[PDB]
């Protein structure tokens, strides 16, 4: 569907740019993501390293662990955009480490586990925020 495909594109495009160094609502989301997601990574490098270790991703397809933790994160019934942006930013940190340990790692299985957790498990919440527009407005700075 639209929300799944739109989200997958946004999250993959961010994850691929991050790993390599390379609709309209989607362009906005992508811009916001670069600014906020980069904010998250810088200043939380040491925490992110620590989590990556404890997760112990063996390869590009070793996502089952990442899925379970992400599900766990949301199991308190709290939903907000700071958390969502954090999940995606960690996603990009993991993508960068994947390419440094195998230069033709596909970022796709990872973007997919993130998109799945987000869109299947927070579908109606996202729809109610008007999707990626809620994200863009939340992180909107003047």
């Amino acid at each position: 569907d639209d929300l799944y495909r739109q989200s997958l594109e946004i999250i993959s495009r961010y994850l691929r740019e991050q790993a390599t160094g390379s609709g309209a609502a989607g362009r906005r989301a992508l811009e916001t993501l670069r600014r906020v997601g980069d904010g998250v990574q810088r200043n939380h490098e040491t925490a992110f390293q620590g989590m990556l270790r404890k997760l112990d991703i063996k390869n590009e397809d070793d996502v089952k662990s990442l899925s379970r933790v992400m599900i766990h994160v949301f199991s308190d019934g709290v939903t907000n955009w700071g958390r969502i942006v954090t999940l995606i930013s960690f996603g990009a940190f993991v993508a960068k480490h994947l390419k440094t340990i195998n230069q033709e790692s596909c970022i796709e299985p990872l973007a997919e586990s993130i998109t799945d957790v987000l869109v299947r498990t927070k579908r109606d919440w996202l729809v109610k925020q008007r999707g990626w527009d809620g994200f863009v407005e939340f992180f909107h700075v003047e």
């Binding site: 404890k54 994160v73 700071g82 958390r83």
Partner: peptide, 23 residues
């Protein structure tokens, strides 16, 4: 449990970003 620690780290950082842009 490694998973509890990872989850908590995610929420700590996530909620901090939430609070910052909420205010």
């Amino acid at each position: 449990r490694p998973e509890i620690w990872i989850a908590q780290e995610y929420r700590r950082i996530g909620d901090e970003f939430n609070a910052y842009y909420a205010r």
